[PDB]
Amino acid sequence: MKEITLTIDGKVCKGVQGDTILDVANKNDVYIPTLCYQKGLTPIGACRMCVVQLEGNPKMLPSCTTPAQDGMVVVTKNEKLKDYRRQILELLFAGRNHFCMYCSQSGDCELQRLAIEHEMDSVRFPYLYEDFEVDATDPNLMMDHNRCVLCQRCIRTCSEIVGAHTLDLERRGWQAKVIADLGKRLRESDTCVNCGACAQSCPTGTITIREFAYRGRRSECDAVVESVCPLCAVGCKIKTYVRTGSIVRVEGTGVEEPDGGQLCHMGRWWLPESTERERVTVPLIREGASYREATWEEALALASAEFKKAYDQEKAGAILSSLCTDEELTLFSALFRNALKMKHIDTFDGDIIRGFFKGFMPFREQGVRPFTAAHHILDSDLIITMFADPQKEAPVVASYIRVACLHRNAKLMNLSYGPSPFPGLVDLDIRLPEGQAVPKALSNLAEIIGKISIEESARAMGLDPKIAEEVALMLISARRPIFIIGGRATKSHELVTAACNLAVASKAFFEDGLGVVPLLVSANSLGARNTVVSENPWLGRERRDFLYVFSTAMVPEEEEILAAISATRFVVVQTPFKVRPLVNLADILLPAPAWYERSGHFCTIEGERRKLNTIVPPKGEIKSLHYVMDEFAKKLGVKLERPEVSPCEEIFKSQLRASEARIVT
Amino acid sequence: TVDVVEKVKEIVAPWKGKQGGLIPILQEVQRELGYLPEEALLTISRELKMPKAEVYGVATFYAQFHLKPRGRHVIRVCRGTACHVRGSLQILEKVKQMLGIEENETTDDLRFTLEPVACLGACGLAPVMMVDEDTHGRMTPDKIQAILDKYQ
Amino acid sequence: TVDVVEKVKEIVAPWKGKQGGLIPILQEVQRELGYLPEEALLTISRELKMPKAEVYGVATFYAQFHLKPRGRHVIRVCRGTACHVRGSLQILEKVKQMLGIEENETTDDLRFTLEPVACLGACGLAPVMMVDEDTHGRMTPDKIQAILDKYQ
Numbered sequence A: 001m002k003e004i005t006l007t008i009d010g011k012v013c014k015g016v017q018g019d020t021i022l023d024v025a026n027k028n029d030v031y032i033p034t035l036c037y038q039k040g041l042t043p044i045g046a047c048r049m050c051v052v053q054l055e056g057n058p059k060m061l062p063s064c065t066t067p068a069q070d071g072m073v074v075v076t077k078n079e080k081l082k083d084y085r086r087q088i089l090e091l092l093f094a095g096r097n098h099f100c101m102y103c104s105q106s107g108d109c110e111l112q113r114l115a116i117e118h119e120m121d122s123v124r125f126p127y128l129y130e131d132f133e134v135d136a137t138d139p140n141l142m143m144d145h146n147r148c149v150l151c152q153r154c155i156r157t158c159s160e161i162v163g164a165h166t167l168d169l170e171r172r173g174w175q176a177k178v179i180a181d182l183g184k185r186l187r188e189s190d191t192c193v194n195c196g197a198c199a200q201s202c203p204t205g206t207i208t209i210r211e212f213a214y215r216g217r218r219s220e221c222d223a224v225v226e227s228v229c230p231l232c233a234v235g236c237k238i239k240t241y242v243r244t245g246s247i248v249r250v251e252g253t254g255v256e257e258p259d260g261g262q263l264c265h266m267g268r269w270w271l272p273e274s275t276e277r278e279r280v281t282v283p284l285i286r287e288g289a290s291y292r293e294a295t296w297e298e299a300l301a302l303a304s305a306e307f308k309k310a311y312d313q314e315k316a317g318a319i320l321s322s323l324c325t326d327e328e329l330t331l332f333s334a335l336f337r338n339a340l341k342m343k344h345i346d347t348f349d350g351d352i353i354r355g356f357f358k359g360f361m362p363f364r365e366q367g368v369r370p371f372t373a374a375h376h377i378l379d380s381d382l383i384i385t386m387f388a389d390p391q392k393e394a395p396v397v398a399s400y401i402r403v404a405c406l407h408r409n410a411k412l413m414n415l416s417y418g419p420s421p422f423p424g425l426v427d428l429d430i431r432l433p434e435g436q437a438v439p440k441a442l443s444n445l446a447e448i449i450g451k452i453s454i455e456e457s458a459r460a461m462g463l464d465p466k467i468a469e470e471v472a473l474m475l476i477s478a479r480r481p482i483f484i485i486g487g488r489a490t491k492s493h494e495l496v497t498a499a500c501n502l503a504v505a506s507k508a509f510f511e512d513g514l515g516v517v518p519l520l521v522s523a524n525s526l527g528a529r530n531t532v533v534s535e536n537p538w539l540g541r542e543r544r545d546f547l548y549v550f551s552t553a554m555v556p557e558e559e560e561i562l563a564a565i566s567a568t569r570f571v572v573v574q575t576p577f578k579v580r581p582l583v584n585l586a587d588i589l590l591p592a593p594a595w596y597e598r599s600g601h602f603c604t605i606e607g608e609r610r611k612l613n614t615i616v617p618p619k620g621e622i623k624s625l626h627y628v629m630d631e632f633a634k635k636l637g638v639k640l641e642r643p644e645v646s647p648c649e650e651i652f653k654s655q656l657r658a659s660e661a662r663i664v665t
Numbered sequence B, C: 001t002v003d004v005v006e007k008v009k010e011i012v013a014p015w016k017g018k019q020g021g022l023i024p025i026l027q028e029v030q031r032e033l034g035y036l037p038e039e040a041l042l043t044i045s046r047e048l049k050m051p052k053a054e055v056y057g058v059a060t061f062y063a064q065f066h067l068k069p070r071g072r073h074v075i076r077v078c079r080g081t082a083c084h085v086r087g088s089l090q091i092l093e094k095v096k097q098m099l100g101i102e103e104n105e106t107t108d109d110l111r112f113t114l115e116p117v118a119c120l121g122a123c124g125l126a127p128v129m130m131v132d133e134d135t136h137g138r139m140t141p142d143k144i145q146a147i148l149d150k151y152q
């Protein structure tokens, strides 16, 4: 029987057969003191605090590791167990140097919660006052080793969840220390992706986020709002802690999902730091090198006068943000795409989105879903990063890649003209030279699928022939390979179709569709395409005397788009913050709801709609964003007609599986 | 510096694509080079595509690996049960205070090194104080000088 | 560090209040310590009440003083007129490129040291390559290995 029935502390409990005693414990209600069990990470049996006794059997066994067997009597609280747990906690306090007076985590420490619960009004064991090093070389994380219980929840979360296996144990016995690469400092480490998942796993204040120390405590939080990171497409699930109108700590829920809560640097370090930025909250005006405070009537008048003298002669554009919700983008489409009919509206990453959705479009004609979910690159056998740097595009995809190619025996092979994104993890490096390399790759894949030749495609690709045949061999020999399309693959939209067609060639089929997993820079990608993305690139290569650019100033902006904005002669930015790269190229600088004072829905390339929640409500009164769009519609000869949010119906649908043909270009 | 990059890159060749084999892959660079420099472990991690942290953890987890240059003559004293009940601790502490160096480290100029071992086998002739070449059966407190000057 | 402060302060005692005697006062600390550390010269300047600059000038002016620790086996090759006309320069440059160390310095771990000397006296058996113990009469280009491995 899978459903087994036990008795923990008298209370009857129900569990699956393979579940450990801790699983059937945390399933119903009952509390067992644990310090080294992180929901997710495989039960590590180090703290020995979860020890429970079975009736009749006079010995004690860990509840985290011992399985539940079909009916048995578990006792968790009595005198002997309390004594042994207090002794374990006191050993931890006596061995390492624990000073709670100045610890960032005094209120969250799980060694402190347990100590107070077991009434530890002493240490009993002699205090060994040995000198463990305080590694605070990293400007973002600090590792104060004299608080380290040695639970390996940081080695395990950097070995099995992040993959960039930076932390391991150093020596044996008492001298065992948690070290970075080759016993060096965290800053000196080449393999730390600066993720912070080591800080979310550490229960004992050793690893702490420095910038938000003493504020990002979970006990002193005013609210706890669950939402979705809006910085990248992976859309990690987050548990933002709010303390007096600012986010102080962003820990990622989803320890049961394949990602495992390892939010990236941009999410554990830019999301709380963005709640403490300059926040204009009053319409400015340039005046020459320094802004002056203007009223909304004055600023919108000076920004609409420049929008009427520049709309008669076409000379007008709009660069909205793809980190905006579908409500805001639908509003912007109501003004820009429909009311005044500008064909010069873009989305600050329009090149990437339009390349992706003009390379994938052949397969939409053929009737297949030419992308799968990133969590399927964890069970693959050969990963091919084509024109990708997943550490700067979607770091959870990079972490999946690393976990696969280290703890699950995969192989990496790159087809990029760049720095080999995983320098020391790829087995075969290709550096395809610039020019026109897409239809020759088409020929190569047409070979790889039809033959199961490369001589002409090699010199045609501008590549040496031996390595071009090794590519084909290692591509056919794989039993479930996956491809990682990059954003750089979208400057020429046919390269993306070459990538997808190579996926059809290499027998890479998954239940969702093809194994290409496009690295979208933005979360609202399909939402941006249906509402703002222009079918032709116009930025840079067209004058555009006026430019309304909406920039939720979160993600680093392509520097080519910023230059194009700087040569415009009137730029109306509606950025929420006063960050550097936007207050320089701006003449008006209106305010905005700043990603945490608005809610939205974010329909994505993979179909389903997410939900962004209002983390902290607005402080001032921008009073709308529709008011700005209306005052633009006013004295311009156009109306607005607020539409409904266009239902995102997943344009790419999988009506075919493991049955596609290649596309000629 | 270039002497330590291909010798380690060649001993790893018969282990590429084979599961396991970091304990032997190191026991060979130890026997060749005398120690495991940081360059050695770095190239092992590069070639096997094993994490550097794991390589350093295995290299520092086991006793018979030395990450620093070991001496040209080891001074293995036996701290086994038979020698200790006989009083080998006295011999150990006097070679300690005589070389003046810490418990398990090398001399300042790489001449000797103290390495307390397990039973070297002469649990009859106890205590044994091997000086990197041969057994030494009795080793009372006064017989330690007549050998430590000889082998240097 | 404390071993080098009274040995030098005692060899200076029979020279206090006597004019001269810095050339001998050093040839003694050289024979005892093997070299002249900065502490040695500092204490000589303190005891004799002679300027430190003068002590360092005399210590670096003459060839047979070594301010750095000399090796445990000197490799004195003869660059005398008789050996040089015979071709001792070839032997010198090959011991140079063989130990890989600069012309007049010690090995990285204090095992050997190359010290080109004047005539060691065997101007008949030329060239001579003394390896800190005994003469060596012929020393053709190939006989340099069979001795440099032996004395180490």
Ligand code: SF4
Residues within 6 Å of the ligand: A098, A099, A100, A101, A103, A104, A105, A106, A107, A109, A110, A111, A112, A147, A204, A205, A206
């Ligand atoms: S880690 Fe926890 S127990 Fe240790 S000093 Fe900090 S708050 Fe106290």
Ligand code: SF4
Residues within 6 Å of the ligand: A157, A158, A162, A164, A166, A167, A191, A192, A193, A194, A195, A196, A197, A198, A199
């Ligand atoms: S920051 Fe991320 S990669 Fe670096 S040690 Fe921590 S968990 Fe590992």
Ligand code: SF4
Residues within 6 Å of the ligand: A147, A148, A149, A150, A151, A152, A153, A154, A155, A178, A201, A202, A203, A204, A205, A206, A207
């Ligand atoms: S650093 Fe923290 S998480 Fe890592 S082993 Fe130590 S106590 Fe555990």
Ligand code: SF4
Residues within 6 Å of the ligand: A229, A230, A231, A232, A233, A234, A235, A236, A262, A263, A264, A265, A266, A267, A268, A394, A395, A396
């Ligand atoms: S990977 Fe993307 S979604 Fe996840 S935390 Fe980082 S920025 Fe947010």
Ligand code: FES
Residues within 6 Å of the ligand: A033, A034, A035, A036, A037, A044, A045, A046, A047, A048, A049, A050, A051, A062, A063, A064, A065
């Ligand atoms: S909590 Fe069960 S052993 Fe760590």
Ligand code: FES
Residues within 6 Å of the ligand: B078, B079, B080, B081, B082, B083, B118, B119, B120, B121, B122, B123, B126, B127, B128
């Ligand atoms: S007891 Fe020391 S040799 Fe076995």
Ligand code: FES
Residues within 6 Å of the ligand: C078, C079, C080, C081, C082, C083, C118, C119, C120, C121, C122, C123, C126, C127, C128
């Ligand atoms: S010539 Fe070299 S010994 Fe005199």
